[model samples]
Each structure stands twice: as C-alpha cells, then as structure tokens.
Target: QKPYKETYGISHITRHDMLQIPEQQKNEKYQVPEFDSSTIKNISSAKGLDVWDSWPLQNADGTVANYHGYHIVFALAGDPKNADDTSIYMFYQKVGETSIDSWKNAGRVFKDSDKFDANDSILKDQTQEWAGSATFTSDGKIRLFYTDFSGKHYGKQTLTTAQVNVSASDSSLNINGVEDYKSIFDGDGKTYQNVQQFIDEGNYSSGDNHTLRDPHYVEDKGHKYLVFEANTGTEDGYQGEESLFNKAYYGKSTSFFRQESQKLLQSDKKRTAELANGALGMIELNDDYTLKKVMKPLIASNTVTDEIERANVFKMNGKWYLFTDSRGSKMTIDGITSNDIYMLGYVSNSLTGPYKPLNKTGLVLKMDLDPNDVTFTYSHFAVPQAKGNNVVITSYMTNRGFYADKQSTFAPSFLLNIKGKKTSVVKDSILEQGQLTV
Candidate 1:
C-alpha cells in the first residue's frame, strides 16, 4: 500500500508571517501578543542575542506559571554587544498568573565565564556555549542539556548537562541549585570526560572533523534517553556513513548512570576499540553509564546531500514522529522550490522507526522569505501538548549576518497537526496570531 502523505500550501505566506513587533501593539493582529516583547527585547539587549532551542515547562501544580503562563528556557549570548560569548538562561513572569506584559527574566542559568576557565584543557579555547534543551524528571527536577564548542576547532563539539530547581511564589520566581555541570558525552567512551581524549586516541576518523552536539532529553516508560547530533564518515566503514554527515544518535539508561559500569567506560583501550570500529547505532548504557550495547542505525542517510541536523523524536497517539532540519536536498513539492534550510518529518508506528516521509518531498515547514528579506528561520523545536494532536513549534529567526536587532527574532509559536502518517499545520492557524512583531 502507498503511504498516505501530507502536503502544504505556502502561496500567501511571507517572511513577515512571524515578524516581531512592539509591545504597545499587543492587541494588534498578526503578532505574537502572547509573548512579552518588551522583556524579550530588554533581555536580549542585556544578555546578547537570544536564539534557538526554546522550551516550555509546566509548574509543579500542573498550571503554567510565571512568564505569561509558562516557564521558558533558551540559549543566550552573554553580551548582545559581543558575538563571542553564549550561554543558557531562564525567563518567567514575576506574577504567577498574568498576561505576556508581566513576564520577568531569571537571567543566565549557565554562563561562559563561570563554567569555562581560560586555562582549562578542553574548553579553555572555546568561545561559544549554547543551545540548551530541557525535560523534567518524574520527581520534578529539571535536566538541561546543551552544546559547548570552540571556534579554534570548527566541528569539534561537546555535550554538557546541568540540573536546575524551580520555585514560584506570589510575585517572585526563584531558580536555584544550578550544579552538576558535566560533559556526559562527546562521542568518546569516557563518562564525564572531554571529547579530546577520544580524538587523541584516534578512535573514529579525525576528531577535528567530528560534530557531536545538540543534546536533547526524552523520557518514556520510565526510561530516559539522550539524543544528539553526530557524524560518521564513509571511511569509518559504517553501513550508511556515505549518506550522512549531520545525523542523530541516542544513548539510553533507566537511570542517569549505572554505578557498576563506571570503571569500564573510563578504560581508554576498551572504550576506544568498542566505539572506533562500530557504526552509528543506539547505545545502551549500563547501570553506571558504561556502554552496554550498540543497536543498528535507526535512520540511515538517504538524501543526495546526506545532511540532516537538529533532530528530535517523540511518540504520540500510538505513532512516532522524527523531525530534522535539512538544506540543499531535492524536494518535489510545488510551493517548496527552495533548496535552502527547511524542516523535514517522518512517521512510523514504533520508536525505533523505519520512518516514511510525511510528504512526497519530505518537506515539513520552511519560511517563505522574499528575495529582499535578509532574516531567515530554521532549527524548529516542536513542543507537544498533553491534550491534542497539535504541537507548537518554534524557530530561530535571524538576519543574514547574525547581528543584534529587530531582524534577529525568534518566531512565535506555530501549530502542527499530526495524524497517522500525515502532518501539517492547523488550517488558518498562522492567521490567528496575525503578524508577529518583536
């Protein structure tokens, strides 16, 4: 049977679809009046360019608290005036219940100056650390994961994790206990260690070319997993390496780490041999966070360019969806003629999917920008709700130069409807918000 595919019509859409507007125009149409534009502007001005990987969390009472109803965490650059420093920060309204106008800023949860030392071996030369994704544990603790990169080594990246505690009062918000800053995984075998070790040992190809970053956390059926961006070359002898450059790989464990396997992961010789000769696969973690198994690759590289990045997978209504951002791939949809960056999606019935495209061209969402429009959007992060098939997706919208201005905007939330093998935006959904002004 032919797979049922979904398609989109982008004729009337423009780059201004989610344009940022002023705070006084909250009542105006085509704008994200739900967002506190004034606070966002002030925070961006103070913390630097805030973009990419925005996440929402519900309070302990199951109600949206602070910052216009929900708690938000996103990546932030230290000084908007300086392009080199980046970190993660949290934002919420001081009032537990209020409109977008009352939102407040919690300020930098993880700062480059505090986390990295100039004399440190691994991160001493690093200039950028951002892109944090978070999830709440069953016991109500927040686990945040992000990327740490150095401009000196272009593609070399490491994944770091931290824990944050959230407390909400009548008119105040408190984010405390920002501890446990550790580099959990770096495509290297050692737990809580630098990726440089794996490179120095000649584990997999050249470390200089490795790109392992953007760590996202997902919990299911009492098991927690960490999924991230990875690179495997054709020369490594992996089955589908020829078709992939930026791809997704995950590691799973019932608990964060298994105490029994700690010694095994730290063994330089044992860990290197296990990872170097292996293909991209699902890594199972021991009780102490050691490598227990490497399952076969879930989604192989298939596109002509072999490029897929910033991926996420989730299960809903008995179906699983896989999302990734791609550029320079051939898409056949009528409205999507551009080969530039856009989001692609796939659907299947299982978590470990033999996923099929949601549309004939595999195009999910992309900004319809005019030739003169310098601002662009990509890196969509879909946020699922508890009661519906519609998921809210947010994107990083910035100018061509990545400068600080109204042009560098984070698009307001948009909805995606998922059903069986098909996925599309809710009809007239974008129109409901009018033009978004930032």
Candidate 2:
C-alpha cells in the first residue's frame, strides 16, 4: 500500500482515497452502430490485415483535411505462392463516412524492391517484412518504424526506420531515405555499443526464442522515447527447477526447506522478479535519432510465461495511458480465461511511471464473440485522436478464422474518462457512421 501511494504520488491514508471516480460518471455501457466491414476488403484479403496505423493529412491550404476521417497505412502481403513479396501501403478515407467504397489507395509506401538490402543483412532472405508504426515529423515528412525478420541468423528480428515524403493532395508517397536500420536492441544475439560498433560485431544473438520488434515512438516534455515489445526469460541466466519442493529436497536434505527459501530469495535478487518475463522496454533517444539510454522495463510481466505485445503510450487529460494485448501459455486474468487475448489498460501520473491497472481486474477489454466457446481477438491497437476525449481501437476478431470478414472491424470511438486516478472507457460514446461532414 505504501509503495502504491508513493508511486502515484498519493498523500491520502485510506484505500478509497486513491480511487478517483469521476463525479458525473454514469454506468458503463457499450453501444453498437452500423459499420461497413468490406471497406478494406481488397487490401485485407489473404491474411494481410494483421496490423495498421492511421493519421490525419493536411490540405494545401494548411487546414486539416479529414479525408472522410483519416488516412490509414497498413502492411500488404503477396500471394501465398510468392510469399517473399510483401510491402507497406496506404489508403485514404474520410472520417465520418460509412462506405470505404470511394477510399483512395495510395499504393505501396515502401517495398522490398526498394534499397532496403543496403541497410540490414536480414533483408536478403526474409520472407516477409511488415507490422510497423508511423508518425509525421516536425517538417511534415512521414517517419516510419518497421520490423525486419530473417530466419537465418537464428531467427533474428530487428527494428528499423525510414523517412518518406508524403503528399496527401496527390495521394503519393516516396521513401526519402533509410537510416542505419540496425537492430536497436537484439534479444536473440549480441548487443551493439553504437552505430560504429556495428562494424565490430556482425550481429548479436540472444540464443533464445525471444524477439524485439513492434517499435512505437512517443514524446513527452520535449523528450523522445521508443517503446517496443521484447520477449525475455524469467530465469535470467540461471536455469533449474523453479519449484520450491524440488529445490528443498534436491539441494539440501537436512535444512532443505530453509535453504530452498534462501535460494529463491537469492535468485530474485539477480533481477526484478516482474521483469524476469517479457516486457515493454523503454529507450530514450538522442536529438539526432541515436540511442541515449535504455531504461528498465516500463511494464514487465509478473508471470513467467505471459507476454505483452504492440504496446503504445499516450497522454490523455494530463495522464499517461499504456495499452497492450497480452498472451502466453499460462495466461490468467480475473475475468479473462487462460490463453485468451485481452486488452490491458494502465494509468500513471508521469510519463515514466509505476503504472497501476485502470480496472480492478486489469481487464479493460476482452474479445470473446461467443462466451460459450473459445473464440478470440488478435492484434488489438488503440489509436488516440488529437482533440477528442476518446480513442479509436481496432482488432481482428476471429469468426471462421482470424482476420475473417466482419471480425476485422474498428470499435466505435470510446470516451476516455478519468476521475481522480481511475480511468475507464465509455463504450460507443462517439458514433462515426453514415455521411457526416468534418
């Protein structure tokens, strides 16, 4: 209790004092509206709707043009026969439009055919390169961060970036240039010292199944940071029977129990127990887009098997919110069943936080189309808008299978409400349907 209070900067002495309920709050509810699912059918077909990013584009007059609402950038894969052919593409649609029937296809933003091979060694034999995040730089160019996968080099995966020039009026985009594009932080192999350090070591391998990818960029108070998903082990570098029973009997027979307890305690000291598992690692960036420092795991899993994926951080109402989808072999949550993908929301008063769960059970949203069976949602992402008190979330719902029709649709914009320290989503708070001018 004392730790919780100090972490969130609470002076109150009571439990309820830490609870911040909005005064005008109403009961939680979900409202469904008529949404068009076939809008992105052409692009999403062939299991291509895995992940996407959206942002508003400006018009020639310097005014924000909603398109209908916003432009979307997503990954597209080629026919299964030519599996090596994959690229990032873009599409434009108005914000409040019901039909994506008239949406403009901006074509491929960057493809393997481009000069990507010069930046990283993995591009040579990679079957697919997709799933990334994008943001407009201060000068109005598009900054893209993407993952590169290579089955060689012991299944090595890396986070890389490229800058592109985008023209919303002409619906055209071209890769301006590529950066060093080396592995920012490699989990499978050797870690690097600096950009020049890349020359000394070919590529570091963690020699584990862990991965480092899905880079999301965030800025706070003029400081820049990158948050990405990293799969790590719970045992650190020590591997043995984790159970106390086995340790007691096997290590010491006379004072077995006491010795085993000490062993567990000693092991815990090697690393923060929560960070023993997978985590969303935070890395501060220097002004010139170089690595500054890698901070401790911003949000680490307490359970050894659980993993947090596609984590994103944003500020709402002067509070920091972290959203991610967790899945693993031994996954368990209060209202969520084992092995099901569910959305977790956490809130903190500071950008770097000792964040607390937004909900009592740490479940902000769960995807179970049918409660009687084991259907699930895959790849959930929350995209917060600029001026609204709500966020737009998208996920692939599994019906016949993952990414099937009607299952891949965006949830209505949810109103983000905060009272005291507690934050909750008011479902379907804003409906974007039919024809509404922005």
Candidate 3:
C-alpha cells in the first residue's frame, strides 16, 4: 500500500526546508507573522473554522520539549455553514512559558454557544454532533466527553458528560461552569457504564459494529483512562471481507465515577486486530481507578495508507508524544476509501511503551499546490504545544481550490525550536491561516 506515489513522495516538505532555522536571528527575534490573507478571507468565510491542534505544556529554559500542557482541549465541526450541524468548536490555549511566536490571542474555549443549548433538556431529542477526548481529574476536575453522530433510525450511539470550571479570569482556561449535562447512556441496551461505557455501549452495539469515536482521556498515578477510535471491524488485511468500515478500539475506567465496567478491548477481538491505524492509547492509573498498565498503541497507521484515525496523547521531555492526522490523497469518501494516510512522529517511552516512528514527514499539510486537487489535508484533535515547551498550536485542513470548493482552515499555531532546529508562525489570524508559503 505504499503506492500513492510512495505515500505522495514521502509527504513533501519544502518551503526552503520549512524556513531553515538554526538560530542566529536573535536580538529579540520575532517577525514570522505575515497573515492577513484578506483577514484570512474574512473570518474564513471562504468557509473556514475547524482548528483542533493542542500541546498545552512543557517549556522553560529547557530548550523545548515535544508535547504536554493544557493536556486535552480541542474542537471543530468544519463551520461551512454548519457542515452537518455536528456542532462543536473550541480553542483556548494556555499552559505556561508562552511564545509560539508571541501567541496572539489564543482564546475561545468553547462554542455551540447558544449558551450550552440543551434545547429543552435531555439533549432535546438528542443529537449533539461532536466533541471528544477531555480529562483533568486527580481532583483538578474537568471531564467533557462527546459523540452522537448516527442518523437513519438512530438505534445506538452516545457517551456524554460535562464538568469544567477554572475560568475566574483565566487560571489557564477551561469553562462549561456547571450545567450538569449528563446522560451516560441508558436507552436500554443492557445497563453498562464505564470501561468507556462498555467501549461506547456494549462492544460496538453489535449488529455489525459501530461505537466510540475520537475519545481520549487520561489519568495516570491516580487511575482513570479512556482511549478510542472506533468501527471495530473490516480493514481486509486480516482475511478481507469485513468492511464494517473504519477501526480502532480500547477502553478503561473502572472508577473515577466511570462506574461499573470491564471489557479490556476486543476488536480483531480474537483475530489479533492490533494492525492499528489512527490509534492512540495511554494508561497508568492506580491511586484508586485501578488498572496499573495499558499503554501500547501510542499512535498507529498501517494499511498502505488511508483513514489514519484520530489519536492525541501528550507529555514532554520526559517523553510520551502522540499527535495524529494522516489522511491525504483527498480524504473523505471515508477518507479516500479508508486509507486516510500520512503524517509523522508517534514516539514514546513509558506512556505504555513500544512507540517509534519519528520522521515520517509525509504530507505535513496539503490541499493542492495542483497535485490535481480533489481536496486533501486532514488534522484534528490534540496538538496545542507550548508550556515548559517546544512551542505549539498546529491544525491543518486546506484546499487552495478543489475538493468540491474545499474549505476548512487554520494555521497560526507554529513555533518550535527543539534546541534551535526551528519553526515559527503565530501572527494570530485567529490562530493561523491554512497555507501559502511557496
């Protein structure tokens, strides 16, 4: 599956080698902010809005770590006139030492902003669209999960919760200050709850699999975990013909109020299903939630390429980084028929071992410099770096023109200097513009 012109010619990286930097521009250095693409096409009304890249913390005379900070906070539903009203949007950056090119307004925090619209309560006939991967516990409190996209006789799919506070003039940032939105799922599929609500409602609610989408929450040392990427069956390589669409599943949460559960995980369930694509997992909780070990798929992508799901784990210098998005070749049609391929670095060292692949660089960001353009460039969730840090904020999804008029933008969260290796772009045009530095 390496064909797609050798993964689009090894992910193409050349803007003078990405602004070649090895330090020596000091004197208070700062001038990589040339945005204003007509104010980013007038508030992305070229149809933009969908930036979910996070790094949150780890930087302070330590040169620059890779990932860690606000931990987990991200959202996007491609605001193209509410694409499918999969409502959800967030960006509130903060986690110390700051200067991913002088930050420039890293704040928004959350949006579906009808002021937490419940419509008339109980999800008002349900259907909230999207929101996933968020955790803070250890008594620092903050848990916000999400997922409910299953139309056409909505038989099964749900995992909701809300509890975030810290916004009394910014204590780093997190807000949804109590509206208590809870419905841990109970339309009767047989009372389950925790272990990721039985991997999103009892083993992908059988009937041919389908549950859990983009969820990523963690709590080490005081136990509490949840890692996901769902579909559960069909990638072919494992004796072909399953086609249940997309795959990746993992679960844990025996306590932390995730209450009553256990299913460890069973995708190729017995067929050795760990070929893993778009996968992200992290576990090390024992203060009370129990489950002392489970950190294997720090980040995965395999099958020649296509549909590299969503994995977003973080931790830095002391090592443990897993950021995701490898869906090029015009993604969509279930990411070009399930091979949403190419992106890099899934390195690890103890967030649950055996993670390696530091320089795959393929398709860092592309929507078409005329590669014929069918519209391709995918990235979302977890990538907000900058705190004891290596500089952060990175999100991509572009289409200069072609992907049916393509539009979903962001690019202003860039500023890396792993000991002066270099990367900078944070002039803040609402967190950065998609691309155009030929």
Candidate 4:
C-alpha cells in the first residue's frame, strides 16, 4: 500500500502502461502539411498561424535560455478553426538554425489592449492564452508562467504570471514590454483544484476536470518549484491511487496484460474516467512568485488520462525527466485509440516524484494517427541538451483536424535518446513535419 517511493503525490498510470502500441517507425514518420497559407508570425492576421502549446525560455536551472543567439519561444496563438482565438506568441530561432526558414514569429506577447498601461501584465479575463513556462528573472526579466484561460472551448483555469523585456538585436527578437501581470497559483481546494472547485463542479464539465493550468518553472535541489497541469479534489472523489487501482482484484502476476488493469477498474465508463484525476501538480515557490506550499503530485494519471497537458521538467544524467502531451481521446486505457497521439515520458530521482515510466511504457512518441486522420500533431517540448542524453522534441503542425480553412504551424523537430529509463527515436530523428527544433 505504499510504493510510490512510499507515497507523496502518489504515483500511478497502469494497464502496465497502456499495453504496447508502438509501430510508427521508418524514422518516426508522420505527414500531413503542405499548405503555405502562413499566419502565425506576427500575431494572427487570422489566416491560420494556429501554433499550439509551446515553451523554451527557461533557466532558473531548467536550461534552454538564449537571446542574442536567439532561441526564445512561447506559443499558443489561435485560429485552428477559431478555438476561441487564443493568444501569446513569440518564436525565434538561431542556434544552428535548422531552417523552418529559420523559425521567427516574434509577435503577440500580450494584448487585451488599453495600450497596456498601469503596470501592464493584464488578462483579467483576457480569454485564452493557455500553456506556460519561462524563467530568467533577477532583472534579466522573462518570468511569464501562464494559463490565464477563461473559455476557449471550456472555462476557468488561471495560474497566470508576467514579466518580460527580451528586446533583442543581432537580427532582432521581440518583447520590449509585458510587466507584473499576476494571478499566481490558484488551486488549494485541499491540495488542488480551486476557484471554488472551478465554479461549482468545473465550469460545465467536459474532460480534464477542473484544472489549474500548466506552470512549469523549476529550480530543484535549491528549492523553488511549480510543476503544473493539475486536478484531484472535492475531498478526493477526484480519485487516484486507491492502491494503484489494484481494487481488490488482488494480484500475484495475473497475466494477459495483467488483466488490462482490471479493465480500467471495471469500467462504468472507465469508472467515470478515473474521476478526472489527471495530476502532476506541485508547488513551493515564495521568493515573490507567491504560494510557497502545496507540494505533492509529481505524477498521477489515475485510471489513465483525463488530461495531463504540457508539464515539463529537465535534468539529465542525474535523471528527473518528465514531459506530457497526451490524448488518445483522453485515454482511460485499454488499447488507446482516438487516433492516438501521445508524448508522455517520466523518470525521477527527485524533483518531488516517485515517477518512473519512460520507455518502460511512458512512451516518448506515439502519434499512431488514422482514425480518419485530419492532420494533427501538438505540444511536445523537451529540449535538454548541453551534452549527452540528447533531447530536443518541439511540436505543432498542420491543423484541420477540425476541417479546413488552413491553420496550425511549426511542426517538425525530433530527437530523443535518454538512457537510464530508456527512450528511443533517433534513427535519424529528422521527423520534421513543420520544423521548429532546438
């Protein structure tokens, strides 16, 4: 009843990790892009620049941080079919510029306009601008911790933050603005999910239950943390870790894929989709980014997938990897299929985790497409590099998975070869569909 490194945020995700579904080899192929109707390079002219969840500006010991040599990124610009017209962009590229025409889209850093005055950093209801991560404060500015959403398909989800000033040169980059916009950590309904349980039961429920959005800033060993994309609350009806779903079907190695994780706890719709317990949360920051407590959850995906968006972490050789981007139709296990598309990986020594799954079935790349393929591919991020264990997996590419009118951009960037927990996909990882690499 303990193991999760003896419980703390209580680890999960089983069906022995989604019973093997690999077979996309041939250099990890994935195609579906050839439109050229550009639109996400300077803040939507609204023609289809629909780039999705992205990040890379870290360095409070999370790595990836460059300027003069450019390598700043921050995505989630809209119109992949008017997903409520999202915002927040700024894409730059340099270091070995592997050409997606040298990635450049430095635009839309924040604008719900009032010509932004009075301590800028607004978004009080600035609609959509989900997914976040960007560290480098201490005057070098660049704080941005985002997720300030309100209804771009679903409602209420804030974790916001702001602090920019990356005005560059040497072939210009952007952001000479954006200041202090705060909303700091909003999920304390007993360790997670708040804003008053997201307005009485997660604003008209869908999937991903009531989440506090993606934050992702980390410092590790010296303390200061964030780690987001969360759920689980209401005094735990948002279940997970009730003995790892061992749920009485007590085992002693019962095979056949170990009873397919007891058919997702004996489905009643996969036990109500495992109570939407998709978590990865974690807290402790307080050096003026506020909220210095709530730390538990370095892993949790209960009966498996209700949502676990872009939650990243980095460290190499000393372990601690973690990356998310899931969907196989919000998986609840048992031969995932909704045109599969995952990029989940996990491993840990610490970074507050009992995490362990990376190649051993936390798959590092799936995209098994063709549920009538509509051209997908999404947020993947995992840039780790400065020597060995070599990572670099950026994503975003072609849309219309919602039916035409041209959109979605920047896709094509691959390369993953961890070692300890095992990961693979470097057989010439030129898997560049839309190309964004770093």
Which candidate comes out best when scored by lDDT?
4
lDDT (0 to 1) per candidate: 0.46, 0.46, 0.36, 0.65
Worst 10 residues of 3 by lDDT: 1-10
Q: State the lDDT of candidate 1 residue by residue for 1-438, as single tens digits.
A: 221111111011111111111121232221211232332322332234444445444332122223433555454534455657565667554333323334356666755454653223555555677564666555566666677776676445766666666666666656765665555555643211224544564645642224466655554454455555554333322212221111121112212123212332353322221232221123443322233443333443321222346657677787777776644323211222353455656676775656665643345665444456555555676665556777766665555455344434455456677777766765445411111111
The Cα error of candidate 1 at residue 22, in Å, is 36
State TM-scores per candidate: 0.64, 0.65, 0.25, 0.33
Candidate 3 residues 307-361, lDDT tens each?
A: 3445555556566555445433422111122332433334456555455433322
Model 2 quality (TM-score): 0.65
How do these models rank on TM-score, best leading? 2, 1, 4, 3
Off by over 4 Å in 1: 1-50, 58-70, 78-83, 93-102, 112-126, 152-154, 166-169, 188-209, 233-296, 329-339, 399-407, 431-438
Instruction: Please write out the lDDT profile of model 4 over residues 1-438, one tens digit for every residue.
Output: 332222233666554555554333222422222222233222233244666777878678676776677777788877654766777787777866655556677678876662245342434445777888988765677787888776643466777777767676777776777766677677777767765655664555633367778888888667778888887554432554453444311222446324655555476556455455677787887877867788767777655665888788877888788888777777765556777677787898977778877766677777656645445556677777777766777777654445454456666666777889877766655543434343
Name the lDDT value of residue 249 in candidate 4: 19
- TM-score winner: 2
Better of 1 and 4 by TM-score: 1
Residue-level lDDT of model 2, residues 1-438, one tens digit each, is 011101112111111211121211112421112233332232232234422333223222112344323654444334333545555555555454545353445666654555455555545555556565666556555566666666554445566666655444434333344544444445421221221222233334421224566777787777777777764332221112232222211222335435434554465322222222345666776765557776655655432322567777777667787766655223321222343445666777887886765654235554433455433335656665555455555543333344333323232333444443455556445433111122
